[PDB]
Amino acid sequence: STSLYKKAGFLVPRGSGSSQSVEIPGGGTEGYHVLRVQENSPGHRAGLEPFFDFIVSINGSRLNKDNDTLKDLLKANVEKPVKMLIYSSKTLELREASVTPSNLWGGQGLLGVSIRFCSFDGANENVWHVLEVESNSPAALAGLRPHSDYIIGADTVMNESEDLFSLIETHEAKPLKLYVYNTDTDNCREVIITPNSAWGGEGSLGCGIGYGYLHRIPTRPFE
Amino acid sequence: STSLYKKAGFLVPRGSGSSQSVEIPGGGTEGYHVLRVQENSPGHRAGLEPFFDFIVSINGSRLNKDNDTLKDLLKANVEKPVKMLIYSSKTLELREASVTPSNLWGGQGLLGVSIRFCSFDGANENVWHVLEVESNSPAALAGLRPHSDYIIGADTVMNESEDLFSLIETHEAKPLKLYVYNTDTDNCREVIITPNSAWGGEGSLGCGIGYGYLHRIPTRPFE
Amino acid sequence: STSLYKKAGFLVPRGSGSSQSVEIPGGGTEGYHVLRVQENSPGHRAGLEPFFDFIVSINGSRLNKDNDTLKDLLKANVEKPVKMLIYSSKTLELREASVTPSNLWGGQGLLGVSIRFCSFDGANENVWHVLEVESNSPAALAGLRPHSDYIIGADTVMNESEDLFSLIETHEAKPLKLYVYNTDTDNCREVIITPNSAWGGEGSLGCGIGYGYLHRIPTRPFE
Amino acid sequence: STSLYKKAGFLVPRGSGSSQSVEIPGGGTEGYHVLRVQENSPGHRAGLEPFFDFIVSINGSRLNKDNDTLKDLLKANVEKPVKMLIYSSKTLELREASVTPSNLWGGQGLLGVSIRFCSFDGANENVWHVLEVESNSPAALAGLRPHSDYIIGADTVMNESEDLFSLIETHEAKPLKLYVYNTDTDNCREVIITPNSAWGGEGSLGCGIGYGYLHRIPTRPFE
Amino acid sequence: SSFVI
Amino acid sequence: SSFVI
Amino acid sequence: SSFVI
Amino acid sequence: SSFVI
């Protein structure tokens, strides 16, 4: 036609919009999003992968939940192996992992895993890539680092966003917490940021943001 | 320190957060944002630059405004030259241009310029770069094109956003209008987009978004 | 080994990889690459587009060889209209433009157009996008600017594949001349750069480089 | 001619351009570049980091030359602890690691580490970020994946500056071997690619390439 | 909103 | 919100 | 290599 | 050019 554009095929990660929720024992679409995994933790030993793994079931019990079931089941099996059903937003697959909650490892908690109850449906898209970072910018002082860091969420209520920017204006002085994935550590951490549109530079954070296929958390070539 | 990062100097466009509103005759910070400039228009002949130019004054009259003054002053001088004061977000400078509104050119309106009343303070940052675009995506069907297109705004009320995403969810079926700058045409145009998070692909638009110094509207090396 | 990647359709520019219909009267694949087009020039008035346009024929005479025919035919029609056949690497199409050479213009040349003889087959790929630029870097001092500049070729007294990196080492102190397209000026200009790997920073130029579909010279949505 | 550009401070990785303190015991600048580190290997247990770590000394013996000393010293201490001096292009610092070579591991090698002898001075720059990848492209079939893969070097039977583009033309049908780092696996692997400029798409590999600060291997915020 | 002039 | 387990 | 016309 | 140890 008159269009100066046409179509071409490109390689994209499997973790994309071909979803598909095939198929969750228990039927749900929600679970516990594995965020930070402390080192030498039970969660680490079980091979739990930050951002990519979702805890779907423990000892056969489905977690359509955000309650205290998981917490209580871990506490009741406090030094025994418990079987977990894990969903990967990377492989789009379910796998069984053995994990032994414990107080005897040197960290915090029984698994040493920071989690959040959310849906894994299209979670691999909802990523904000930190691009350039100005000196003395809010992002810099908060701990955000260029290109290595990926913003994957915040602490949010009442019913609000799935999208990042809709928070930056809300906390125009009120401090803000961010869930940040780093591609070197392959792990999540919390970042305290103080949005300031008057900080004397770019935007309210002083950093660039990438969204989309060019700005996703990297994936290995093979399962 | 323990930081694995340090600081380095880089080249950035003058049009950045060193603002500074030096200095508007009349004192304001707002004016008429020059969007689309039709070809063979009076606005084109006057050298009005899409996105970068702001109309600040006509025949000495300051436009702290969003009313019918400009419209009426153009209509009263309907085939005479009128003097305009223009502010450039590119050069951060004021210049005088002669422009002759007319009905005798072959386009629409007396200047052939689409405008919007807004503030020019930090307008060079508020740009959303269209990155990759999926086939049959809402962005594709709306007319959005990869890398060449820059989203610079929408039609918005009641008091709401300056940021783009906070609209994509609002119009989850309701059609949406976007102001898009294309780096080949060096011009603005309106794009009708139908956000659909269930379109079977990435996000609600099916395109990537870049924001920041790596994703700004390009600037020539010299004034 | 199951791949964690799959295929998806995306929008790409028509001239990518210009694949493949030559349809050229005269039979060749080579012509005169339109580089810089001076302002208020006969060439500007004729609508010649820098980088994208190729002069393939004048008054019916095919330009298969880097000789003085084109210069001489313009000189013989020195204040009369001449018909040129133009090929666009943007539209992949042929069009005729009327142009009137002149001695009265009185800038440099009869048309005010800088050209070079090369092939148009896949010329839209041979582009290097200048990304970030360090302060006091060779790129900075030579005049190269971040994101706005695109390196589209060079002059070689010696002989190489013109490939960018394959020249930077050859000219490890010896100055190098580059042809640079700027997406704001929509024009080409010459940049003399002095590659220095011992300069206080990254690489030999002190700038980033992008290559590919994410780093092409932008194209308007329609023909 | 007033420049429309100015200078601003931004965050960059410490090893950029690693500038410049060598502080090396033994005096050299060269060592053994740690490439692939096998899983559950002695090298893995010793904490050797692929691409970033350089083995400079073993048991006090400096490794200034590409010989069999390192192999032989490991072989003489075949089930005993060995002290290695390690240089990191990430931290620009030296550390000692204890490693116990073994025949019982029983993967390939005594440590299970792929290495190559080169200089660590400015090795964090010599990286090519694989961007987009076309379907059925040479890059696709060789195994290269978009955004996750980083090309960090190659093997040459002939002799060149190893520079990427300066090899792709040399190997215009002849296969080429590449060393590729993946930010998910945090490991190196070998990719045999067959450059073909006559393949149905962009360039000879069918992929995009990024170079510079926007395209470096990611680094954690802290040492 | 935007409007032509 | 997030919490450690 | 370039020249003006 | 690479070799395992």
JSON list of C-alpha atoms in Angstrom, two decimals, chain B residues 94-199:
[
{"chain": "B", "resi": 94, "resn": "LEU", "atom": "CA", "xyz": [12.96, 34.25, 21.76]},
{"chain": "B", "resi": 95, "resn": "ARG", "atom": "CA", "xyz": [12.66, 35.35, 18.15]},
{"chain": "B", "resi": 96, "resn": "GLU", "atom": "CA", "xyz": [10.32, 37.53, 16.16]},
{"chain": "B", "resi": 97, "resn": "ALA", "atom": "CA", "xyz": [8.61, 36.09, 13.10]},
{"chain": "B", "resi": 98, "resn": "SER", "atom": "CA", "xyz": [6.37, 37.77, 10.57]},
{"chain": "B", "resi": 99, "resn": "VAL", "atom": "CA", "xyz": [3.30, 35.75, 9.62]},
{"chain": "B", "resi": 100, "resn": "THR", "atom": "CA", "xyz": [0.38, 36.57, 7.35]},
{"chain": "B", "resi": 101, "resn": "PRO", "atom": "CA", "xyz": [-2.82, 34.71, 8.21]},
{"chain": "B", "resi": 102, "resn": "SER", "atom": "CA", "xyz": [-4.87, 33.99, 5.09]},
{"chain": "B", "resi": 103, "resn": "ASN", "atom": "CA", "xyz": [-7.82, 32.18, 3.53]},
{"chain": "B", "resi": 104, "resn": "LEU", "atom": "CA", "xyz": [-6.07, 32.09, 0.15]},
{"chain": "B", "resi": 105, "resn": "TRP", "atom": "CA", "xyz": [-3.60, 29.30, 0.82]},
{"chain": "B", "resi": 106, "resn": "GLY", "atom": "CA", "xyz": [-4.96, 25.87, -0.03]},
{"chain": "B", "resi": 107, "resn": "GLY", "atom": "CA", "xyz": [-5.18, 24.45, 3.49]},
{"chain": "B", "resi": 108, "resn": "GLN", "atom": "CA", "xyz": [-7.26, 24.69, 6.65]},
{"chain": "B", "resi": 109, "resn": "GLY", "atom": "CA", "xyz": [-7.27, 27.66, 9.01]},
{"chain": "B", "resi": 110, "resn": "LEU", "atom": "CA", "xyz": [-5.60, 31.07, 8.76]},
{"chain": "B", "resi": 111, "resn": "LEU", "atom": "CA", "xyz": [-2.10, 29.94, 9.80]},
{"chain": "B", "resi": 112, "resn": "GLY", "atom": "CA", "xyz": [-2.38, 26.24, 9.01]},
{"chain": "B", "resi": 113, "resn": "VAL", "atom": "CA", "xyz": [-1.06, 25.39, 12.43]},
{"chain": "B", "resi": 114, "resn": "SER", "atom": "CA", "xyz": [-2.47, 23.02, 15.03]},
{"chain": "B", "resi": 115, "resn": "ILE", "atom": "CA", "xyz": [-1.77, 24.39, 18.51]},
{"chain": "B", "resi": 116, "resn": "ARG", "atom": "CA", "xyz": [-2.25, 23.70, 22.20]},
{"chain": "B", "resi": 117, "resn": "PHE", "atom": "CA", "xyz": [-2.08, 25.97, 25.21]},
{"chain": "B", "resi": 118, "resn": "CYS", "atom": "CA", "xyz": [0.42, 24.57, 27.70]},
{"chain": "B", "resi": 119, "resn": "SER", "atom": "CA", "xyz": [3.61, 25.39, 29.54]},
{"chain": "B", "resi": 120, "resn": "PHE", "atom": "CA", "xyz": [6.94, 25.17, 27.74]},
{"chain": "B", "resi": 121, "resn": "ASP", "atom": "CA", "xyz": [8.71, 24.64, 31.05]},
{"chain": "B", "resi": 122, "resn": "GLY", "atom": "CA", "xyz": [10.23, 21.19, 30.71]},
{"chain": "B", "resi": 123, "resn": "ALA", "atom": "CA", "xyz": [8.35, 20.25, 27.55]},
{"chain": "B", "resi": 124, "resn": "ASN", "atom": "CA", "xyz": [11.44, 18.77, 25.87]},
{"chain": "B", "resi": 125, "resn": "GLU", "atom": "CA", "xyz": [11.45, 15.95, 28.45]},
{"chain": "B", "resi": 126, "resn": "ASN", "atom": "CA", "xyz": [7.80, 15.00, 28.17]},
{"chain": "B", "resi": 127, "resn": "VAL", "atom": "CA", "xyz": [8.28, 12.78, 25.12]},
{"chain": "B", "resi": 128, "resn": "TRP", "atom": "CA", "xyz": [7.47, 9.11, 24.66]},
{"chain": "B", "resi": 129, "resn": "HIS", "atom": "CA", "xyz": [9.48, 7.34, 21.99]},
{"chain": "B", "resi": 130, "resn": "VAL", "atom": "CA", "xyz": [7.69, 4.60, 20.09]},
{"chain": "B", "resi": 131, "resn": "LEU", "atom": "CA", "xyz": [10.11, 1.67, 19.96]},
{"chain": "B", "resi": 132, "resn": "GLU", "atom": "CA", "xyz": [9.23, -1.72, 18.47]},
{"chain": "B", "resi": 133, "resn": "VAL", "atom": "CA", "xyz": [5.72, -2.25, 17.09]},
{"chain": "B", "resi": 134, "resn": "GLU", "atom": "CA", "xyz": [4.05, -5.66, 16.82]},
{"chain": "B", "resi": 135, "resn": "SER", "atom": "CA", "xyz": [2.02, -6.66, 13.77]},
{"chain": "B", "resi": 136, "resn": "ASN", "atom": "CA", "xyz": [-1.75, -6.22, 14.09]},
{"chain": "B", "resi": 137, "resn": "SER", "atom": "CA", "xyz": [-1.10, -4.42, 17.39]},
{"chain": "B", "resi": 138, "resn": "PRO", "atom": "CA", "xyz": [-3.34, -1.50, 18.43]},
{"chain": "B", "resi": 139, "resn": "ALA", "atom": "CA", "xyz": [-0.36, 0.78, 17.77]},
{"chain": "B", "resi": 140, "resn": "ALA", "atom": "CA", "xyz": [0.13, -0.63, 14.28]},
{"chain": "B", "resi": 141, "resn": "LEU", "atom": "CA", "xyz": [-3.52, -0.31, 13.29]},
{"chain": "B", "resi": 142, "resn": "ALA", "atom": "CA", "xyz": [-3.69, 3.20, 14.72]},
{"chain": "B", "resi": 143, "resn": "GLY", "atom": "CA", "xyz": [-0.81, 4.29, 12.49]},
{"chain": "B", "resi": 144, "resn": "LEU", "atom": "CA", "xyz": [2.03, 4.31, 15.03]},
{"chain": "B", "resi": 145, "resn": "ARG", "atom": "CA", "xyz": [5.39, 3.42, 13.52]},
{"chain": "B", "resi": 146, "resn": "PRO", "atom": "CA", "xyz": [8.58, 2.08, 15.14]},
{"chain": "B", "resi": 147, "resn": "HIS", "atom": "CA", "xyz": [11.44, 4.40, 16.15]},
{"chain": "B", "resi": 148, "resn": "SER", "atom": "CA", "xyz": [10.35, 7.21, 13.80]},
{"chain": "B", "resi": 149, "resn": "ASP", "atom": "CA", "xyz": [7.36, 8.19, 15.92]},
{"chain": "B", "resi": 150, "resn": "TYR", "atom": "CA", "xyz": [7.40, 10.10, 19.22]},
{"chain": "B", "resi": 151, "resn": "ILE", "atom": "CA", "xyz": [4.27, 10.41, 21.36]},
{"chain": "B", "resi": 152, "resn": "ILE", "atom": "CA", "xyz": [4.13, 13.96, 22.74]},
{"chain": "B", "resi": 153, "resn": "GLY", "atom": "CA", "xyz": [0.59, 14.12, 24.11]},
{"chain": "B", "resi": 154, "resn": "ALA", "atom": "CA", "xyz": [-3.15, 13.43, 24.04]},
{"chain": "B", "resi": 155, "resn": "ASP", "atom": "CA", "xyz": [-6.51, 15.13, 24.55]},
{"chain": "B", "resi": 156, "resn": "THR", "atom": "CA", "xyz": [-6.96, 15.36, 28.33]},
{"chain": "B", "resi": 157, "resn": "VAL", "atom": "CA", "xyz": [-9.48, 16.61, 30.97]},
{"chain": "B", "resi": 158, "resn": "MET", "atom": "CA", "xyz": [-10.52, 16.77, 33.81]},
{"chain": "B", "resi": 159, "resn": "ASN", "atom": "CA", "xyz": [-7.33, 17.52, 35.85]},
{"chain": "B", "resi": 160, "resn": "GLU", "atom": "CA", "xyz": [-5.19, 14.47, 35.25]},
{"chain": "B", "resi": 161, "resn": "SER", "atom": "CA", "xyz": [-1.84, 13.41, 33.77]},
{"chain": "B", "resi": 162, "resn": "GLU", "atom": "CA", "xyz": [1.34, 14.78, 32.29]},
{"chain": "B", "resi": 163, "resn": "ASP", "atom": "CA", "xyz": [2.48, 11.17, 31.95]},
{"chain": "B", "resi": 164, "resn": "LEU", "atom": "CA", "xyz": [1.40, 8.92, 29.08]},
{"chain": "B", "resi": 165, "resn": "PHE", "atom": "CA", "xyz": [0.55, 5.47, 30.57]},
{"chain": "B", "resi": 166, "resn": "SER", "atom": "CA", "xyz": [-2.04, 6.93, 32.96]},
{"chain": "B", "resi": 167, "resn": "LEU", "atom": "CA", "xyz": [-4.31, 7.24, 29.91]},
{"chain": "B", "resi": 168, "resn": "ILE", "atom": "CA", "xyz": [-3.83, 3.82, 28.28]},
{"chain": "B", "resi": 169, "resn": "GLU", "atom": "CA", "xyz": [-5.83, 2.09, 31.02]},
{"chain": "B", "resi": 170, "resn": "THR", "atom": "CA", "xyz": [-8.51, 4.80, 31.04]},
{"chain": "B", "resi": 171, "resn": "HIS", "atom": "CA", "xyz": [-9.42, 4.17, 27.41]},
{"chain": "B", "resi": 172, "resn": "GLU", "atom": "CA", "xyz": [-9.53, 0.37, 27.68]},
{"chain": "B", "resi": 173, "resn": "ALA", "atom": "CA", "xyz": [-12.10, 0.47, 24.86]},
{"chain": "B", "resi": 174, "resn": "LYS", "atom": "CA", "xyz": [-12.90, 4.19, 24.55]},
{"chain": "B", "resi": 175, "resn": "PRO", "atom": "CA", "xyz": [-10.81, 5.41, 21.55]},
{"chain": "B", "resi": 176, "resn": "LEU", "atom": "CA", "xyz": [-7.80, 7.65, 22.31]},
{"chain": "B", "resi": 177, "resn": "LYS", "atom": "CA", "xyz": [-6.19, 10.53, 20.44]},
{"chain": "B", "resi": 178, "resn": "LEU", "atom": "CA", "xyz": [-2.43, 10.98, 20.48]},
{"chain": "B", "resi": 179, "resn": "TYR", "atom": "CA", "xyz": [-0.15, 13.78, 19.34]},
{"chain": "B", "resi": 180, "resn": "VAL", "atom": "CA", "xyz": [2.66, 12.12, 17.44]},
{"chain": "B", "resi": 181, "resn": "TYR", "atom": "CA", "xyz": [5.87, 13.66, 16.13]},
{"chain": "B", "resi": 182, "resn": "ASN", "atom": "CA", "xyz": [7.67, 11.92, 13.27]},
{"chain": "B", "resi": 183, "resn": "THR", "atom": "CA", "xyz": [11.41, 12.51, 12.83]},
{"chain": "B", "resi": 184, "resn": "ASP", "atom": "CA", "xyz": [11.24, 12.09, 9.05]},
{"chain": "B", "resi": 185, "resn": "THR", "atom": "CA", "xyz": [8.34, 14.50, 8.45]},
{"chain": "B", "resi": 186, "resn": "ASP", "atom": "CA", "xyz": [9.56, 16.72, 11.29]},
{"chain": "B", "resi": 187, "resn": "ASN", "atom": "CA", "xyz": [5.88, 17.27, 12.02]},
{"chain": "B", "resi": 188, "resn": "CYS", "atom": "CA", "xyz": [3.01, 16.40, 14.34]},
{"chain": "B", "resi": 189, "resn": "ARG", "atom": "CA", "xyz": [-0.12, 14.44, 13.51]},
{"chain": "B", "resi": 190, "resn": "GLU", "atom": "CA", "xyz": [-3.08, 12.93, 15.34]},
{"chain": "B", "resi": 191, "resn": "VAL", "atom": "CA", "xyz": [-3.34, 9.18, 15.87]},
{"chain": "B", "resi": 192, "resn": "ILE", "atom": "CA", "xyz": [-6.50, 7.32, 16.87]},
{"chain": "B", "resi": 193, "resn": "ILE", "atom": "CA", "xyz": [-5.61, 4.42, 19.15]},
{"chain": "B", "resi": 194, "resn": "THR", "atom": "CA", "xyz": [-7.78, 1.74, 20.74]},
{"chain": "B", "resi": 195, "resn": "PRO", "atom": "CA", "xyz": [-6.01, 0.38, 23.86]},
{"chain": "B", "resi": 196, "resn": "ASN", "atom": "CA", "xyz": [-6.66, -3.36, 24.26]},
{"chain": "B", "resi": 197, "resn": "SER", "atom": "CA", "xyz": [-4.81, -5.31, 26.96]},
{"chain": "B", "resi": 198, "resn": "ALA", "atom": "CA", "xyz": [-6.44, -8.45, 25.55]},
{"chain": "B", "resi": 199, "resn": "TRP", "atom": "CA", "xyz": [-5.25, -7.87, 21.97]}
]
